[PDB]
Design a protein around this ligand. Sequence first.
Ligand SMILES: [Cl-]
Ligand code: NA
Ligand code: NA
Lengths: 14, 551
Amino acid sequence: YRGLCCGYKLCRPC
Amino acid sequence: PRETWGKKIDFLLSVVGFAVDLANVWRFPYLCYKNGGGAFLIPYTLFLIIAGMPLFYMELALGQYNREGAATVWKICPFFKGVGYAVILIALYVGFYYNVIIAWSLYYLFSSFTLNLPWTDCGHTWNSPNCTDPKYSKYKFTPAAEFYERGVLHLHESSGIHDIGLPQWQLLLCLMVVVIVLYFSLWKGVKTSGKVVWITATLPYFVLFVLLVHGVTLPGASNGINAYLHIDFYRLKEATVWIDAATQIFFSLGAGFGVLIAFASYNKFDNNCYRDALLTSSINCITSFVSGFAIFSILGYMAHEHKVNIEDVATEGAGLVFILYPEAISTLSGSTFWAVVFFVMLLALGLDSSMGGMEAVITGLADDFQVLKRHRKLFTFGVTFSTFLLALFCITKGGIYVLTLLDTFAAGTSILFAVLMEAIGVSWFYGVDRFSNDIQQMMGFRPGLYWRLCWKFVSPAFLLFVVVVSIINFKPLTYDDYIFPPWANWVGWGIALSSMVLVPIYVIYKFLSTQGSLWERLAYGITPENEHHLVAQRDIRQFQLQHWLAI
Ligand SMILES: [Cl-]
Ligand code: NA
Ligand code: NA
């Protein structure tokens, strides 16, 4: 998705 | 001698338990709903067929034939032993912060043994003066949102990563229980670890069935289900939809993380692992699709309650599980039975994945040093105690800032790079033709043309597409409305580079230690350890063009 950065186990608003 | 699984069913429940975790619940249904609805399953099922299963099949057959862990399995290509040390260190990094997430679930389970849930009113000592009785996903002044960031995390007392403070004693005590449970379930090998998964790998399925039966009865549940399985075929014209399914497949199967190779090393030699690769890969993906029905039943119920649209309620992990579900639970009749069963399911989901990751370090390292293999109880104490000590940074007042930094850089580009190098060595340097001769040695049937083509051309190309994309689509660290200082990004890249730099380093050490001519030191490092006698006979397979043209 656009505007959401996801890493392994959690996603943050970038 | 080497121990083996007590029963065949023990091996199957261990792989399923490690593969299924919170990522199958709090991430996948949100991605499916946001990307294309029912059309998101086309690129998702495609990457499973051509990339998810060939790598799953490859890793299970690697451990069974060689009977070695991740680090020491590279006796076939001695120049690649640095890849094994890269996956061991990465498995240690994840343990420093994944056990903290489990501690949150245990903290919520201990607060559910009452007739008044803590997250229902605005009259406690952790409440801001502006707490209001209940985009609903961004409001931070609700009873459920004030119990997570001000009652458990204690985030309001930290100003950033430059001042984190002392660990919280309530969260410290919950972390102690998790580590003690982890130690006693791993200190005796697989004779004890194979019985723990009889409960933890099956309990979430029992709860999920009960949650699904009751979920479809609540008012507004049909609206959430209809919006979950809508079809939008014009969303496949965007490149981001295909990248979203590519990263989900690789990170939700966990193939190449060093765990599956350790589990298969205790299997019998004649065991049929081709059947196991297809069965366990499908259960993981079917579980994700089924779980979306239960989640969107609650989301539709919440949207009907607040008289808003389904687009204003949908959330992702750590905001849907700890801030959203407790709010909907607090109105479901009993409101205490539902609270207990929900957080029991989360504990069963995460405990199997923590056990699998820690076994990849004990099995991998005990097979490198023989002294460690002779002291299993003392070595297991060292690994768990170090995890507990180094996880004290993530339970501080500013603990979520440290946890965010570790989550981005421990895995990602580093783990994608190590798996890419592992596939290159097995398929090309070792030889696909040799690999298929070993599978026929145990089972009696050769894999086939489709499997041989996916191991040598398709899987390496798929991995390379995800490595390049990850670097290009990188943004500086942030959390909510907090922007990390610039130096915090340099520290993050140092953690990621620590695992990656190990691969080139071992090549230099291996070359500079062995003696011989310039073209002799090169031949020893590419020949399997059990075939070193033919190096001096001037007949090396890898030195002829016919070897590299095999399909
Ligand atoms: Cl998934
Ligand atoms: Na799990
Ligand atoms: Na998974």
